[PDB]
Amino acid sequence: SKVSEQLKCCSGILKEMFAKKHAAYAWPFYKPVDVEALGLHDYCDIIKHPMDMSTIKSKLEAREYRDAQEFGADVRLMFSNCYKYNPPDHEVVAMARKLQDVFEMRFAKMPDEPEE
Amino acid sequence: WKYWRKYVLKIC
Amino acid sequence: WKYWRKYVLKIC
Ligand SMILES: [N]
Ligand SMILES: [N]
């Protein structure tokens, strides 16, 4: 079905997001923000729905996304959390933008009917 | 600090 | 920052 194949494409996009060639800016997003290890006493005040690439992977494998647009929304929640929490000139914001640039171009170009 | 392999980044 | 052959360089 178109949905199952578009989800497969989403896995492939996430796999590229994890690949070495994008690591220099993607890596802050590989895993949940460890608020305790980092001592971020204000993170949970500001970010009500944390998201990261490993969690998105787990949700795809547990079939939690109805379709590619629910996958995309979680990817964009990731980036939004980073834009919301950090100062706009912070290194991690630029890093999020560079990774978002890759994600948006791949996500936009995904076939509308990949099963065909 | 966040860490991944040879990379580090101050978030706090 | 990145640990890169002795150096520690800012690539981000
Ligand atoms: N920080
Ligand atoms: N950087």
What's the CA gap between A98 and A105, in Å, rounded? 11
Q: Which domain holds residue A33?
A: 2-109
Record the tokens describing residue A74, joined without a space.
């979680």
Residues 1-12 of B with CB under 8 A from C: 6-9
How many angstroms separate the CA of residue C5 from the nearest CA in chain A? Answer: 16
The secondary element (H helix, E strand) that includes residue B7 is strand B7-9
* Residues in chain C, total: 12
Q: Compute the half-sphere exposure of residue A79: CA atoms within 13 Å on the CB side of its CA.
A: 18
Instruction: Please tell me the total count of domains within chain A.
Output: 1
The answer to whether residue A115 sits within a structural domain is: no
What's the CA gap between A107 and A109, in Å, rounded? 6
Q: 3-state SS of chain A?
A: CHHHHHHHHHHHHHHHHCCHHHHHHHHHHCCCCCHHHHCCCCHHHHCCCCCCHHHHHHHHHCCCCCCHHHHHHHHHHHHHHHHHHCCCCCHHHHHHHHHHHHHHHHHHCCCCCCCC
Nearest CA to ligand 1 atom 1: B12
Ligand 1 geometric centre to CA of A72 (Å): 29
The answer to whether residue A64 sits within a structural domain is: yes
Give the CATH number for residue A66. Answer: 1.20.920.10
Residues with Cβ within 8 Å of residue A97, at least 6 apart in sequence: A79
What's the CA gap between A77 and A90, in Å, rounded? 18
Chain C residues closer than 8 Å to B9 by CB: 1, 12
The answer to whether residue A30 sits within a structural domain is: yes
The answer to whether residue A116 sits within a structural domain is: no
8 A C-beta contact, residue A38 and residue B11: yes
What's the CA gap between B12 and B1, in Å, rounded? 7
The answer to whether residue A43 sits within a structural domain is: yes
DSSP label at residue C8:
E
Q: How was this structure determined?
A: X-ray
The answer to whether residue A42 sits within a structural domain is: yes
> SS3 for B2?
strand
Interchain CB contact of A97 with C (< 8 Å): no
Q: Is the CB of C12 under 6 A from ligand 2?
A: yes
